[PDB]
Write an enzyme that holds these catalytic residues in place. Structure first.
Site, PDB file in Angstrom:
ATOM      1  CG  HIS A  74      -1.876   1.085   1.360  1.00 18.93           C
ATOM      2  ND1 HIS A  74      -1.527   2.356   1.767  1.00 18.93           N
ATOM      3  CD2 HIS A  74      -3.215   1.116   1.144  1.00 18.93           C
ATOM      4  CE1 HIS A  74      -2.604   3.122   1.787  1.00 18.93           C
ATOM      5  NE2 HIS A  74      -3.643   2.392   1.422  1.00 18.93           N
ATOM      6  CB  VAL A  80       1.496   6.005   2.269  1.00 21.73           C
ATOM      7  CG1 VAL A  80       0.434   5.463   1.313  1.00 21.73           C
ATOM      8  CG2 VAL A  80       0.899   7.007   3.258  1.00 21.73           C
ATOM      9  N   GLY A  83      -4.589   4.952   6.106  1.00 20.07           N
ATOM     10  CA  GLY A  83      -5.308   5.718   7.108  1.00 20.07           C
ATOM     11  C   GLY A  83      -6.345   4.886   7.832  1.00 20.07           C
ATOM     12  CB  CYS A  84      -8.570   2.104   6.798  1.00 23.23           C
ATOM     13  SG  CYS A  84      -7.462   0.769   6.230  1.00 23.23           S
ATOM     14  CG  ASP A  88      -9.201  -1.242  13.258  1.00 24.29           C
ATOM     15  OD1 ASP A  88     -10.436  -1.246  13.070  1.00 24.29           O
ATOM     16  OD2 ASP A  88      -8.606  -2.122  13.905  1.00 24.29           O
TER      17      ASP A  88
END
Lengths: 175, 168
Positions: A74, A80, A83-84, A88
């Site tokens: 990713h 990077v 963001g998820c 979480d």
């Protein structure tokens, strides 16, 4: 209530791994994720009367190195941190706090009000910090937490999330 | 002239920067890819007449996240269904011809009201665009829904994704 909680102000990586196995809070309490879903290495502070609403403050950290599993996929050519996964980490900390207060059940994130990303975690970063300010904490037949959260990389705020919501559920048959 | 559906092989090519042009935004690869196929893409389709994407993820008990989230209680992380929706917003921007690096910029209200267990069969993602902005930063804003075996379980309002010429 779960009287078996090992209730301390900070937790090590070994503690977090024990939590993933259901050992830190005991049989009744919510486990953290394990393995590649665990998004922190330690909890540095838990203050029951702390934070913006005097209902709880939690701070945790994830150590960054270039080999973390998510960088390679990713994205190819552009590593990077998703963001998820930082989001979480914050949901997991909300559910962990409910367990830390003796709440029993499986953790289920219920959602978030608003998330804003203004920066990124690259593989040359050193430390991600999560800061959680609890706004509503219900510890009754219903067990739910509502919090605002921030994600920092190397001391710089890069994500904010308002109205993070997580519940604990003795049974998930309503899901 | 654009294709209206993509296979797993296409999505894996996207992860390598090999589906659209070299400058198109790649999908995540490997364990971060949260879809098997894109079944429909409509320019100016969907609930606001501004774009539509529908995609699917086949569920089986061997998907990697079940074993670690959680031990004794396998369930798909809501955050990964949310990520699939961001992935699809960015993919649509690249499908239109937009170039750059994809970054989620935010979301409004997200609700997880159901769960995906290892005995589920299919997750469906539906993305309804509200705005596509072609500026120095290419931005997409959309609402999204996640279904499992026909039942809506996650919703997201105001998913926002940007394609950056350079990174923020």
């Amino acid at each position: 209530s779960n009287a078996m909680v090992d209730k301390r102000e900070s937790y090590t990586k070994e503690d977090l791994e024990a939590s993933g196995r259901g050992e830190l809070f005991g049989a009744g309490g919510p486990p953290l994720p394990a393995g590649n879903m665990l998004m922190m290495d330690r909890i540095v502070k838990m203050i029951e009367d702390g934070g913006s609403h005097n209902k709880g403050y939690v701070e945790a950290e994830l150590d960054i190195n270039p080999d973390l599993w998510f960088f390679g996929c990713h994205f190819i050519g552009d590593p990077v941190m998703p963001g998820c996964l930082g989001l979480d980490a914050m949901w997991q900390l909300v559910g962990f706090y409910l367990g830390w207060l003796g709440g029993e059940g499986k953790g289920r994130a219920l959602g978030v009000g608003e998330v804003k990303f203004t920066g990124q975690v690259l593989p040359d970063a050193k430390k991600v910090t999560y800061r959680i300010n609890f706004k509503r904490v219900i510890m009754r037949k219903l067990i739910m937490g509502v919090a605002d959260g921030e994600v920092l990389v190397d001391g710089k705020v890069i994500y904010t999330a308002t109205d993070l919501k997580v519940g604990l559920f003795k049974d998930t048959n309503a899901f």
